[PDB]
Design a protein around this nucleic acid. Structure first.
Ligand SMILES: Nc1ncnc2c1ncn2[C@@H]1O[C@H](COP(=O)(O)OP(=O)(O)OP(=O)(O)O)[C@@H](O)[C@H]1O
Ligand SMILES: [Mg+2]
Ligand SMILES: [Zn+2]
Lengths: 628, 123, 498, 52, 418, 186
RNA sequence: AAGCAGGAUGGGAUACAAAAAAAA
RNA sequence: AAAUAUGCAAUCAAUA
RNA sequence: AAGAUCAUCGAAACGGUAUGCUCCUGAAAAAAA
C-alpha cells in the first residue's frame, strides 16, 4: 500500500503458476460422503430452501448409505438427478471391480458376469443422458465420472463441455453456491463453479481441450472411405394434396397467416467449448514450472499437441511447446522413464526449436530404460513390470495408436510389450526435426521382433493378434522416416496379418459380388476396430517397397490385401486407390494380381476418373521400383 | 456508411484494376491515361487524322478548361441516361468496355508498365 | 489419419491452386524423403500455372526448387516466359538473385542469360559491396562469363574499395572476395590488382587466416607478381596452430581449403596431422571426421596411406552404425576418391606410391561395411547425396567387376547404378552451344547435352582416355570419366571435352 | 529423347507471351462460339431489332 | 502475489495522479469518457483484466526473461516472441483498454514505451507541411510535439541510454534514409552523365577490329561507372551530426530536435534508429489507432489528383504517420516489440487484410464482447463508481442481451437509461 | 446418339385466363392419366402451382373534363405446372397433356432430353477370399410420382442451376436502348 | 467555451530498392 | 472462440 | 432506396433564380454574355 492506499506495482509484475491436483475416485468420494453423512445433515424463500434441503437429503440417502434405481427396463424413464446418481454409482462399482479351484473359477465367472451387467447398465444410462438435457452440475458430474472410468462418448461429451463453458462464463460463476452434496467433500473444497473448474485436474483440462468433436462421416473420410454428405430432405406435392387454383379463398378461410414467404432460420454454432478450451490451455501453459510433475507435463503436452482445435493462438503454442521441452530437458532420465510412451507420442507431432534436443534426451532415456527393464525369467518379469508401469502412467482420456489407458500369461505379456515397443518406435520415427540413427532403429526393431516371436502366434482369440491398425501405423512411420523395414520384423508382421485375416475368415458369422463386399465391410467395420482400407494400402505399399534388389510370404500378403480391398475399391478415397494400384504395379508384386481382369478394370476406371494421372508412372511412385 | 460511396454492397461500377499488380483506377483516369500515352499507342500501331489528338498529351493543356472540357466530353456520364433507364433497366458498369479498349490499345500500366491485363472491377 | 500423406499431396498437386502449389512445394522442400516423380509433377504444374504467378512468387518457387538441385524443360520454359515480367524495372538485389538461381539450377540459355547480363551491366553502379561480392562469386562460378561484365565488376569493386578507403578487416575481406571471384575467371585487370597488392603490403599482419588463404588462392589463380610473398612475412604459424588446436576450427579450415581449391603441401600435411590427433576424441569422429576426411581426399594429399588409416580405424567402423546416412555417404565418397587416386597412380596417369594389397583390402572392407550399413538408409538421403553415392558405386563396380566386394555389396552397387536420381540441367556456355538442336541424356548421375603450352595430363578409368588439363580435380575427373562410361553403355561414343 | 527446347521456348522468339497466347485463344474461342459483336461503328443499327 | 488465470474480468484500481503520471500522453480509446462519467473527482480509476491482456503480459514477461538472461550471459531469443502483436475486433470490445492496462504495467516493470493513442492527430489536425525530394512531407511542429510527448516519461531512460555512433548520422531532413535520399536524385544525375558521356565520345571521335570495338566498349563502360560514382559522391544530403557530432545520450538528440525546428523529423528518426540498435532496455512501440495512419489525411495536394484520392495526401505519406505505420521494422528491432491496435470509430472494418500491411495470422489477437461475467463486473464497477443511478439486478441479463456485450453499446445504453 | 436420349423431364405449364378453365384442364389431365395402359402406376406428375398475374388500364369516367373520376380495367392470368419425370410413354404423356386443355387454356411444354454418355465400365466378379495354409493346417402411394426420389432431386437441382444461369445472362444482356455500347458513335 | 427545425463530409495495404555435409 | 467482419422494402421454397 | 446508426467539418458555409462551352434522347432541344 502506497501513500495513496493503492497496491504497490510489484504485486502485479508477475503471472502466477498453476498447480495440479489428484483425480479423486468416485468410490473415495462416496466413502467420504458416507463418513460425513451425519455432519452434513447437522450442518443443514423458506419453501424453496426446504425443498432444496429435502432434495439434498434424498440425494445423500441415494448415493451414500440410506424397484430401486437399478432397474434395466426403467432406466430409460429416469430424471436428470436420478440418471446422474445412477451413473456415479455405476462408475464407483466399475472402479471397485477393476481394483477350491472350481469355486475360484466360478467366482471369477460371476465377477465377469457382474462386469458385463455393469457395462450394459452404463450404456443404458449414457443413452438416457444423451436423450435428456443436463444442467451444469449434472454435466460436470457426468464428465468427472467419464474421466474416472475412462469411458468417453463421442456424442455426449460435447454437450457437457458446452454446459460447462456456459456455467463457467455465466455471471453467477463465482457467486452461485454448488448444490450437489458430493461437492461438500471435494478436495480442495470449492464454493463456486469457476473454483471447481479451476481445481479440475490437469488430466480433465487436457480432456476438455482435446475433445474429438468429429462426425462419423468425417471419421470415415479420414479412415479412407468416400462418405458424401447426406442429401437434404425434399417434400414433393401430391395430387391428393395439390394446391387449389384459387388460393385467395383458401387464405381467406384460414384463422391466421398459415403461409408466407419462405423464412427459415438456421442454428449457428456459438463457441461450443472453444473458449473454455483456450482458458484450460492457458492454465496448462501456466502450469509449466520446475515444481510440476511429469504426470502434469504429459497433460500439458497433450494440450499442446495437434489437438482437435488450436487452443493456443499464434505464438502461444510454439512458446508453450518450447517451455515444456526445456522443462523436460531439465529433468533426469529416471523422472522421464515412467512417462516415455505418452511424452514421445505427444511431442513427435510438433516441431519446435528444442524438439531435436528433447528427443535426443528421450532417446538416451529409452536406451537406458530398455537395458534396465531387460528388453535387449527375471527379464520377463522386468518387461512385464515396465509395460504395466507405462500403460498405468498413460494419462486418462487419451489413446496411443490404440493403446488404452489401463493395465495390460506370457504370450499376453509379450503381445502388450510388442504393442508398446511398436508405439514407441512409431513415435520416435514420426519426428520431423530428429532422425534416429540406424543403431537405435535396429535396436528397437530387434526388441519388437523378439517380443513378436515370444507372442503366441509366432511361437486363441482375436485379442492375441497384433491389430492391422497398429501394423499400418508402424509401417507408415517407417515409410515416412526413410528406413526400410527390417526383413525379420516385416516377416513377423506379415505372419500376424495372415493369421488374423485367416482367423476372421474362419470365425466369420445372384450375390456374385455382394457377399465379397459384405465380407470386406464387416472386416473394416467400426465394431471390430482393427482394420482400415488406408492401413491395407499402407501395408501394400510397404510390401511393394522392400530392401532394394520371403517372396512367398510377400506375394501371399499382397494377394490377401488385394482380395480384401478389391470389392470395396470403388468406395475408397482416390489417394487410397492410387496407393493400392501403384503398390500392386511394382516389380516386387505378384504378376497374377496385376493380370486379373478385375484389377485391369479397376485401373482403367481409376485412370478415367483421374485423367491427370499418367498411367506409366503407376508402379514407380512414392519410392518404388516399376515392373519394367 | 451513411454516404459511403460503395453502396451497402461496395459496388465499384467505374473501378478498373490491373491483374499484374495492385494498381487500380476509374474510367475518367483511364481516359486521361489513354490521352497521355498516345505516343506509346501510336508507336505500337506503327495535319493527319491519326495524330489529331496529340495536343491533348500535355498535362497543363488538360488542366486548362480547354482540355478539361474535352476530357469530360470524351468521358460522358455512363451512370446518367434517360429517366426511363430505371428499375431493371438501370445503367450497367461499362468497365468491360473500358478494359477492352485499354487492352486493344496496349496502354501501359502506370505501376508496373505492363501491356495487357486490366480486368474489370477492383482486385 | 490412416492415409498416405505423399499420395494426398500428389493428388493435391495435380488439382491445386497457385497458393496450394506453393504450400506443397515448401512441404516437399522441408520434407525428409524426396520423390523425383513428385518433383517432375511439380515442375509441370509450375509450367502450367506460370501465368498465374507474380515475379516474387516465381522467385520464391525458384528458390524452393534450388533447395534441392533440380531443373527441367518445363521450369526453363516458365522462367523464359516470365523473365521479362521479372526484369521490368529490376533491382540490383533481384538481378543478383536471378543470376544466382540460374547458375544453381543450370538455366544456361541465351534467352535466360542475355537480358540478365544486360541489366546487370547497365545497373552495375547500383550494386553495393555485398551484392557486388555475390555477383563476382556467381560470375566466377558461371561458364564463359562476358569480358565486359567481368571488367565492369572489377571497376565497381575498385571504385567501392576507393570509396571505403574492424574497418581494415571488412576492407580486406571485400577486396579479396572480389579478387578471388574475378580470378576464378582469369583475365586482365590493373586497378583492382594494384589496390589489393597495396592493401596486402599495408596490413599483411592484420590478415586473418581465411583472408590470407583467399589471398593466396587468388594470387595463385591469377599468376600475380606477388601478394602471398608479403603475406609470408606475417607469422602464419600461430594462426595455423590456433586453427588446428580446435576441431571445429579444423573443419572450418578444411571447408575453406576445399572451397578455394588450395593444395599446399605444408598446410595439407599439418591438417592431416591435426585430423589424426583429433581422431582420438570420440566427438571428432561422430561430428567432424566424416566431412573432414572427404575434404582431405578432395584436396588430394600426397600420402594416400593416412586417409586409408583414418577410414580403417576400428573405432570408426564400430561407430559407423550410429552415424547418419549423410556421414556414411561422405565416407564412401572419400573412399571412392582414394580408390580413384590409387587407380590413376597404378596406371601411371598420376605420380606416387599406389596402395599396397594390405591397404586395398582394408579399404575394400571399409567400403563393404559402409555400403551394407547405408543400404537400409538409401531413401533417407538428398538427391545430391544419391547422385554422389551413384558415382561412388559406379567407380567401385568399374574397379571390382572390371579390390573385391561381397555379393550383397555388388548387388547394391548395381541397384544404385540402375536407380533414378533425377539429374538437373547441365551447365554449358550460352553462346557456344546451339541449344536449338540439342537434347538431354541421363548419363551416370548427370545430364549430358547431345548434338545430332598447356600440358594435357591424361586419366583412364575402365578403358577411356582423355587429354584433360594439368590441374584437374579428383572428383571432377572421376565424375567426367564415369559420365563417359555411362554414355558408352548407353550407346554414345563420340565424346568431346573442352 | 529429351530436347532442351520446348514449343513455348520456340514460340517465345517471335514475342508471343504465354498470357497473350492464353488471352488470344480464349478470345478466338469466344468469337467462334458467340459472335463478332465488337461494338464497331454502325453495329447498333444491326443489333437493334426492327419494328415495322 | 501476482495475477492468475482466475483473475480475468476483475478491475485493477489506479490513483488518478499515479495514472496520469504513468500515461502523460493520455488514456487510449474512450476510457476518458467513462472517467468523465464518474462523478467523484478523486476516486481511483479501474481497468478490467482480459484474456488478451493476460496473454500479452505473459508474452512480454517471457521476452523480458529471455533478454535479461542474454544480457547476463553477455538461442534463447528464438524462444521469445519477436515482431509484436496486432489487436483487432469489433468496435467497443476493449482493444484500447487492453493497452491502457498493459502500458502502465510495462512502465512499472521498466519498459521503454513509445505510446501513441491518437495517430490520427498527425493527419487530421492543422499544421504546416513541406515536401522533400523523396516524397515524404515534413511536419516539424508535429515531430517536436511527438518528441515532447515521448520525453514526458522516457526522458530519464533516453538520457541513460548511450548513443550508437555507427547508427547516428544517417537520417535525412525528412527522416528517410540517406541512401533513399540519394536515390531520389538519380534522374538529374543520369541526365548529366549522359551529357558528359556524349562530350567524351565526341572527344574520342576527334582523337580518332572486334578487339578494338570491345576494348573501346570496355573503356567507355569503365569511364561511365567512374563518372557515375563521382557524381554520386558530389550529391550531398544535410546531416544533423555536423551540428551535433558527439551526442552523449539519445535524450541529447531529442532535446536538439525539440530546440531546432528544422531538424525535428531527423532527430525523431535518429531516436527511432537508436531504439532499433539499442540493447540495454526492453522497448515497446504501442499504437492505439494504428489503422488510422493509412487513410487519406485532411491535407490536400495537386500531386494526388484523381478518383483514387481526389487530391488528398495519404496519411502514411506524412512524416509521423509514415514512421508509425511500419510494422515489419520490429524484426529490425533487437530488444523491442511493436503492439498495434485497430479502431473502427469512423469507418467499418469491411474487407480488412492486415496480411497486406505485413501482419501474420499468428500475430493477430482478437478481443470480443464481454462475456456475461465480464459484463456483470463492468456494471458492478459502474454502480460502485456511481455512474449509473438505481440499476436493478433483475434487468442484468436483459440489458446484456440488449447490448450484445459490446462495451460501447453497454456504456451508451446504461448512461442513457440509468 | 438420338437412339440413346431419354426424356428426363417434361414440365407442362397450363396458362389460363379463367379459374374454371384451369380446373377443367386439371380434371381432364387427371382423367386421361387415370386410363393409361402399360409396381406399375400411372405416370403421375408432380404438381407445381404458379402464382396469379394481373394488369391494369386506367381511364376517366367521363367523355369530357372531370379528370378526378377514373375507372380501372383489371385482367388476370393463372398458371399451373405439372412435371413428369423419366418419361418412357412419351406419346401417352404428350397426348394426355395436350388433350387435357379445356376452354381457352394454353400450355407451354418444357422438354429435357438427357444422354448418359459413355456407359460405366463393368467390373467383373471381385476375387474371392480364401483361407491360407495356416487356416488349412488349423409408386406404393396413389397419386404420387412413381419415379425415383433421387432422380427427381437431380433433375430439380439441374433445373435450378439452369434457371440461375438464364437469369444471370438475361440480366446482364438486358438494355433499355438495345444495340447501344458506351463510347461508340451514338 | 453549441441552450443547434441549419449546410457539407463518410478514400485499407499488396507484387516494390529504408534503417545499409553440394566444387556450396 | 484460428467462426463473421455484420444496416432495412414494396414478387417468388409449389423452388433460392 | 431515402429518411438511417455511428462519426467529422460546421453557420448567411442556408436558399438555387441566373449564367455560352459539357452529357442523354431523337432526323431535328440551334445561336448566344
Ligand atoms: N477492460 C475494460 N475495462 C473497462 N471498460 C472497458 C474495458 N474494455 C472495454 N471497456 C468499455 O468499452 C469501451 C472500450 O472502448 P475501446 O476504445 O477500448 O474499444 P475498441 O475495441 O478499441 O474500439 P474502437 O474500434 O472504437 O477503437 C468503453 O466503453 C469502455 O468503457
Ligand atoms: Mg480503440
Ligand atoms: Zn499493373
Amino acid at each position: 500500500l502506497l501513500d495513496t492506499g493503492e497496491i504497490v506495482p510489484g504485486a502485479f509484475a508477475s503471472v502466477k503458476k498453476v498447480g495440479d491436483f489428484p483425480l479423486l475416485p468416485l468410490s473415495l468420494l462416496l466413502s467420504r460422503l458416507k463418513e460425513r453423512r451425519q455432519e452434513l445433515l447437522r450442518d443443514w424463500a423458506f419453501a424453496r430452501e426446504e425443498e432444496r434441503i429435502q432434495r439434498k437429503i434424498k440425494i445423500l440417502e441415494l448415493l451414500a448409505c440410506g424397484g430401486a434405481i437399478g432397474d434395466a427396463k426403467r432406466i430409460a424413464f429416469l430424471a436428470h438427478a436420478d440418471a446422474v446418481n445412477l451413473l456415479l454409482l455405476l462408475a464407483a462399482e466399475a472402479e471397485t471391480l477393476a481394483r477350491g479351484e472350481i469355486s475360484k473359477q466360478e467366482e471369477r465367472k460371476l465377477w465377469r458376469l457382474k462386469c458385463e451387467g455393469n457395462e450394459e447398465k452404463w450404456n443404458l444410462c449414457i443413452s438416457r443422458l444423451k436423450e435428456l438435457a443436463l444442467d451444469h452440475e449434472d454435466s460436470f458430474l457426468v464428465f468427472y465420472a467419464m474421466c474416472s472410468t475412462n469411458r468417453f462418448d463421442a456424442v455426449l461429451l460435447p454437450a457437457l463441455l458446452e454446459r460447462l463453458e456456459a456455467s463457467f462464463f455465466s455471471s453467477q460463476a463465482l457467486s452461485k453456491p454448488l448444490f450437489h452434496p458430493i461437492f461438500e467433500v471435494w478436495d480442495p473444497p470449492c464454493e463456486s463453479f469457476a473454483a471447481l473448474l479451476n481445481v479440475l485436474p490437469l488430466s480433465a483440462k487436457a480432456v476438455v481441450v482435446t475433445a474429438d468433436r468429429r462426425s462419423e462421416r468425417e471419421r470415415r473420410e479420414n479412415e479412407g472411405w468416400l462418405a458424401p454428405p447426406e442429401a437434404p430432405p425434399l417434400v414433393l406435392p401430391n395430387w391428393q394434396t395439390m394446391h387449389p387454383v384459387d388460393m385467395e379463398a383458401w387464405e381467406k378461410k384460414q384463422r391466421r397467416v398459415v403461409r408466407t414467404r419462405h423464412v427459415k432460420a438456421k442454428v449457428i454454432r456459438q463457441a461450443d467449448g472453444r473458449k473454455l478450451a483456450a482458458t484450460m490451455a492457458l492454465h496448462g501453459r501456466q502450469a509449466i514450472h520446475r515444481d510440476a510433475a511429469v504426470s502434469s507435463l504429459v497433460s500439458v503436452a497433450a494440450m499442446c499437441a495437434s489437438n482437435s482445435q488450436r487452443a493456443l493462438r499464434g505464438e502461444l503454442l510454439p512458446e508453450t511447446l518450447n517451455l515444456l521441452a526445456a522443462e523436460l530437458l531439465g529433468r533426469s532420465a529416471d523422472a522421464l522413464s515412467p512417462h516415455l510412451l505418452s511424452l514421445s507420442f505427444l511431442l513427435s507431432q510438433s516441431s519446435v526449436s528444442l524438439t531435436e534436443r528433447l528427443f535426443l534426451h528421450l532417446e538416451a532415456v529409452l536406451r537406458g530404460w530398455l537395458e534396465e527393464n531387460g528388453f535387449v525369467e527375471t527379464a520377463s518379469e522386468k518387461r512385464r513390470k515396465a509395460s504395466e508401469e507405462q500403460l498405468r502412467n498413460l494419462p486418462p482420456g487419451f489413446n496411443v495408436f490404440g493403446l488404452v489407458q489401463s493395465s495390460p500369461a506370457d504370450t499376453e505379456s509379450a503381445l502388450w510389450e510388442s504393442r508398446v515397443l511398436a508405439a514407441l518406435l512409431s513415435s520416435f520415427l514420426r519426428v520431423d526435426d530428429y532422425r534416429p540413427s540406424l543403431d537405435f532403429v535396429l535396436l528397437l526393431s530387434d526388441a519388437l521382433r523378439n517380443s513378436l516371436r515370444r507372442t503366441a502366434v509366432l511361437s486363441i482369440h482375436k485379442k492375441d493378434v497384433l491389430s492391422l491398425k497398429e501394423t499400418g501405423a508402424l509401417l507408415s512411420s517407417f515409410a515416412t522416416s526413410g528406413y526400410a523395414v527390417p526383413p525379420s520384423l516385416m516377416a513377423c508382421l506379415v505372419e500376424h496379418f495372415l493369421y488374423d485375416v485367416d482367423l476372421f475368415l474362419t470365425s466369420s458369422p445372384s450375390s456374385s459380388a455382394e457377399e465379397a463386399e459384405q465380407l470386406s465391410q464387416s472386416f473394416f467395420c467400426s465394431s471390430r476396430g482393427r482394420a482400415t482400407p488406408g492401413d491395407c494400402a499402407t501395408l501394400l505399399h510397404s510390401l511393394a517397397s522392400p530392401s532394394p534388389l520371403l517372396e512367398k510370404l510377400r506375394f501371399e500378403a499382397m494377394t490377401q490385401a488385394w482380395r480384401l480391398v478389391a470389392p470395396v475399391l470403388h468406395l475408397l478415397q482416390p489417394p487410397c486407390k492410387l496407393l493400392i494400384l501403384n503398390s500392386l504395379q511394382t516389380a516386387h508384386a505378384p504378376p497374377d494380381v496385376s493380370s486379373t481382369a478385375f484389377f485391369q478394370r479397376s485401373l482403367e476406371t481409376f485412370l478415367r476418373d483421374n485423367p491427370d494421372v499418367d498411367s506409366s508412372l503407376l508402379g514407380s511412385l512414392f519410392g518404388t521400383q516399376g515392373r519394367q | 456508411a451513411a454516404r459511403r460511396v460503395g453502396g451497402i454492397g461496395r459496388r465499384c461500377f467505374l473501378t478498373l484494376h490491373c491483374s499484374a499488380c495492385s494498381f487500380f483506377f476509374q474510367t475518367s483516369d483511364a481516359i486521361k491515361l489513354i490521352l497521355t500515352q498516345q505516343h506509346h499507342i501510336l508507336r505500337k500501331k506503327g495535319a493527319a487524322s491519326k495524330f489529331s489528338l496529340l495536343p491533348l498529351a500535355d498535362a497543363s493543356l488538360l488542366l486548362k478548361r480547354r482540355g478539361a472540357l474535352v476530357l469530360r466530353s470524351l468521358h460522358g456520364d455512363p451512370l446518367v441516361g434517360s429517366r426511363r433507364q430505371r428499375g431493371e433497366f438501370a445503367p450497367q458498369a461499362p468497365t468491360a468496355e473500358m478494359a477492352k479498349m485499354l487492352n486493344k490499345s496496349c496502354v501501359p500500366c502506370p505501376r508496373c508498365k505492363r501491356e495487357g491485363r486490366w480486368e474489370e472491377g477492383k482486385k | 489419419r490412416s492415409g498416405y500423406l505423399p499420395a494426398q499431396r500428389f493428388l493435391s498437386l495435380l488439382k491445386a491452386s497457385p497458393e496450394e502449389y506453393r504450400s506443397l512445394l515448401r512441404e516437399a522442400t522441408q520434407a525428409k524423403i524426396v520423390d523425383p516423380a513428385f518433383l517432375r509433377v511439380a515442375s509441370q504444374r509450375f509450367f502450367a500455372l506460370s501465368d498465374r504467378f507474380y515475379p516474387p512468387e516465381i522467385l520464391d518457387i525458384l528458390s524452393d526448387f534450388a533447395s534441392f538441385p533440380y531443373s527441367d524443360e518445363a521450369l526453363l520454359a516458365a522462367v523464359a516466359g516470365r523473365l521479362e515480367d521479372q526484369l521490368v524495372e529490376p533491382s540490383p538485389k533481384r538481378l543478383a538473385a536471378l543470376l544466382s538461381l540460374s547458375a544453381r539450377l543450370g538455366l544456361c540459355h541465351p534467352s535466360i542469360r542475355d537480358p540478365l547480363t544486360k541489366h546487370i551491366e547497365e545497373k552495375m553502379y547500383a550494386f553495393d559491396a555485398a551484392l557486388l561480392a555475390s555477383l563476382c562469386r556467381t560470375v566466377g562460378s558461371l561458364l564463359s562469363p562476358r569480358l565486359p561484365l567481368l571488367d565492369g565488376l572489377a571497376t565497381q569493386a575498385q571504385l567501392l574499395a576507393s570509396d571505403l578507403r574492424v574497418a581494415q578487416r571488412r576492407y580486406i575481406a571485400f577486396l579479396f572476395r572480389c579478387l578471388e571471384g574475378l580470378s576464378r575467371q582469369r583475365y586482365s585487370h590493373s586497378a583492382l590488382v594494384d589496390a589489393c597488392v597495396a592493401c596486402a603490403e599495408q596490413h599483411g599482419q592484420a590478415f586473418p587466416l581465411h583472408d590470407t588463404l583467399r589471398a593466396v588462392a587468388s594470387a595463385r589463380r591469377l599468376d600475380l607478381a606477388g601478394i602471398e610473398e608479403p603475406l609470408r612475412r606475417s607469422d602464419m604459424a600461430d594462426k595455423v596452430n590456433r586453427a588446428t588446436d580446435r576441431g571445429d576450427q579444423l573443419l572450418a579450415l578444411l571447408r575453406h581449403l576445399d572451397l578455394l581449391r588450395l593444395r599446399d603441401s605444408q598446410l595439407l600435411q599439418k591438417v592431416s596431422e591435426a585430423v589424426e590427433l583429433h581422431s582420438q576424441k570420440a566427438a571428432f569422429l561422430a561430428t567432424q571426421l566424416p566431412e573432414a576426411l572427404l575434404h582431405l581426399t578432395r584436396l588430394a594429399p600426397a600420402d594416400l596411406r593416412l586417409p586409408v588409416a583414418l577410414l580403417s580405424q576400428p573405432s570408426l567402423l564400430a561407430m559407423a552404425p550410429r552415424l547418419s546416412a549423410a556421414q556414411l555417404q561422405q565416407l564412401l565418397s572419400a573412399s571412392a576418391l582414394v580408390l580413384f587416386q590409387h587407380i590413376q597412380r597404378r596406371e601411371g596417369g598420376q605420380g606416387g606410391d599406389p596402395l599396397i594389397s594390405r591397404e586395398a583390402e582394408a579399404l575394400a572392407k571399409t567400403v563393404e561395411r559402409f555400403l551394407d550399413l547405408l543400404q537400409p538408409q538409401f531413401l533417407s538421403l538428398n538427391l545430391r547425396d544419391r547422385r554422389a553415392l551413384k558415382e561412388a558405386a559406379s567407380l567401385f563396380l568399374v574397379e571390382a567387376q572390371g579390390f573385391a566386394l561381397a555379393p550383397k555389396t555388388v548387388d547394391f552397387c548395381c541397384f544404385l547404378e540402375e536407380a533414378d536420381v533425377a539429374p538437373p540441367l547441365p551447365l554449358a556456355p550460352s553462346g557456344g552451344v546451339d541449344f536449338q538442336s540439342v537434347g538431354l541424356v541421363e548419363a551416370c548421375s548427370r545430364l549430358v547435352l547431345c548434338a545430332d603450352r598447356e600440358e594435357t595430363t591424361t586419366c583412364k578409368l575402365g578403358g577411356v582416355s582423355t587429354d584433360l588439363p594439368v590441374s584437374i580435380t579428383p572428383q571432377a575427373a572421376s565424375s567426367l570419366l564415369l559420365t563417359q562410361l555411362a554414355l558408352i553403355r548407353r550407346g554414345i561414343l563420340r565424346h568431346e571435352i573442352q | 529423347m529429351r530436347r532442351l527446347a520446348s514449343p513455348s521456348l520456340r514460340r517465345l522468339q517471335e514475342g508471343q507471351t504465354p498470357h497473350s497466347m492464353r488471352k488470344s485463344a480464349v478470345a478466338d474461342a469466344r468469337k467462334k462460339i458467340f459472335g463478332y459483336a465488337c461494338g464497331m461503328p454502325g453495329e447498333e443499327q444491326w443489333v437493334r431489332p426492327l419494328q415495322g | 502475489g501476482g495475477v492468475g488465470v482466475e483473475d480475468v474480468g476483475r478491475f485493477r484500481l489506479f490513483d488518478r495522479h499515479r495514472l496520469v503520471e504513468l500515461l502523460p500522453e493520455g488514456l487510449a480509446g474512450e476510457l476518458s469518457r467513462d472517467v468523465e462519467m464518474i462523478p467523484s473527482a478523486t476516486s481511483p480509476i479501474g481497468v478490467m483484466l482480459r484474456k488478451a491482456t493476460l496473454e500479452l503480459q505473459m508474452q512480454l514477461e517471457l521476452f523480458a526473461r529471455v533478454h535479461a538472461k542474454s544480457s547476463a550471459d553477455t538461442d534463447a531469443r528464438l524462444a521469445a516472441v519477436q515482431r509484436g502483436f496486432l489487436l483487432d475486433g469489433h468496435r467497443g470490445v476493449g482493444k484500447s483498454c487492453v493497452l491502457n492496462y498493459l502500458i502502465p504495467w510495462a512502465r512499472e516493470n521498466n519498459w521503454l514505451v513509445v505510446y501513441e493513442p491518437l495517430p490520427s492527430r498527425y493527419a487530421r489536425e492543422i499544421g504546416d507541411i513541406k515536401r522533400s525530394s523523396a516524397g515524404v512531407y515534413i511536419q516539424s511542429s508535429f515531430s517536436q510535439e511527438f518528441l515532447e510527448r515521448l520525453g514526458r516519461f522516457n526522458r530519464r531512460l533516453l538520457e541513460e541510454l548511450p548513443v550508437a555512433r555507427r547508427c547516428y548520422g544517417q537520417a535525412a531532413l525528412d527522416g528517410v534514409h540517406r541512401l533513399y535520399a540519394e536515390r531520389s536524385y538519380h534522374s538529374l544525375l543520369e541526365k548529366a552523365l549522359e551529357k558528359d558521356l556524349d562530350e567524351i565520345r565526341e572527344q574520342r571521335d576527334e582523337e580518332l577490329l572486334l578487339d578494338s570495338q570491345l576494348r573501346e566498349e570496355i573503356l567507355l563502360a569503365r569511364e561511365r561507372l567512374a563518372l557515375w560514382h563521382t557524381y554520386r559522391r558530389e550529391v550531398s544530403i544535410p546531416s544533423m551530426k555536423s551540428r551535433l557530432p558527439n551526442p552523449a545520450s539519445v535524450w541529447e538528440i531529442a532535446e536538439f530536435g525539440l530546440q531546432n525546428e528544422a531538424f525535428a523529423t531527423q532527430a525523431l528518426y535518429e531516436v527511432w534508429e537508436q531504439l532499433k540498435k539499442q540493447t540495454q532496455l526492453n522497448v515497446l512501440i504501442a499504437v492505439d489507432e494504428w489503422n488510422e495512419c493509412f487513410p487519406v489525411s485532411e491535407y490536400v495536394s495537386m500531386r494526388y489528383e484523381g478518383t483514387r484520392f481526389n487530391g488528398h495526401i495519404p496519411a502514411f505519406h506524412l512524416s509521423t504517420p509514415r514512421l508509425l505505420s511500419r510494422f515489419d521494422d520490429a524484426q529490425q528491432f533487437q530488444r523491442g516489440l511493436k503492439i498495434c491496435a485497430t479502431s473502427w470509430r469512423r469507418s467499418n472494418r469491411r474487407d480488412y487484410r492486415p496480411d497486406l500491411l505485413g501482419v501474420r495470422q499468428e500475430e493477430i489477437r482478437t478481443v470480443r464482447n464481454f462475456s456475461p461475467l465480464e459484463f456483470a463486473n463492468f456494471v458492478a464497477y459502474y454502480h460502485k463508481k456511481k455512474i449509473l443511478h438505481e440499476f436493478p439486478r433483475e434487468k442484468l441479463d436483459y440489458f446484456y442481451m440488449l447490448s450484445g456485450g459490446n462495451g460501447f453499446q453497454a456504456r451508451r445504453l446504461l448512461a442513457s437509461l440509468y | 446418339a438420338l437412339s440413346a436420349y431419354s426424356l428426363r423431364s417434361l414440365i407442362v405449364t397450363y396458362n389460363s385466363r379463367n379459374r374454371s378453365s384451369m380446373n377443367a384442364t386439371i380434371e381432364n389431365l387427371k382423367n386421361a392419366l387415370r386410363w393409361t395402359s402399360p409396381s406399375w402406376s400411372p405416370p403421375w406428375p408432380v404438381p407445381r402451382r404458379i402464382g396469379r398475374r394481373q394488369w391494369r388500364v386506367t381511364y376517366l369516367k367521363s367523355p369530357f373534363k372531370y379528370k378526378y373520376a377514373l375507372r380501372h380495367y383489371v385482367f388476370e392470368d393463372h398458371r399451373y405446372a405439372f412435371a413428369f419425370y423419366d418419361v418412357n410413354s412419351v406419346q401417352e404423356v404428350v397426348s394426355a397433356a395436350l388433350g387435357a386443355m379445356a376452354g381457352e387454356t394454353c400450355c407451354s411444354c418444357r422438354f429435357s432430353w438427357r444422354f448418359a454418355g459413355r456407359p460405366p465400365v463393368s467390373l467383373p466378379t471381385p476375387p474371392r477370399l480364401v483361407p491360407s495354409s495356416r487356416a488349412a493346417s488349423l409408386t406404393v402411394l396413389r397419386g404420387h410420382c412413381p419415379t425415383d426420389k433421387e432422380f427427381i432431386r437431380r433433375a430439380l437441382e439441374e433445373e435450378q442451376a439452369v434457371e440461375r444461369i438464364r437469369k444471370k445472362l438475361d440480366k446482364k444482356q438486358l438494355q433499355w436502348f438495345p444495340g447501344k455500347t458506351p463510347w461508340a458513335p451514338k
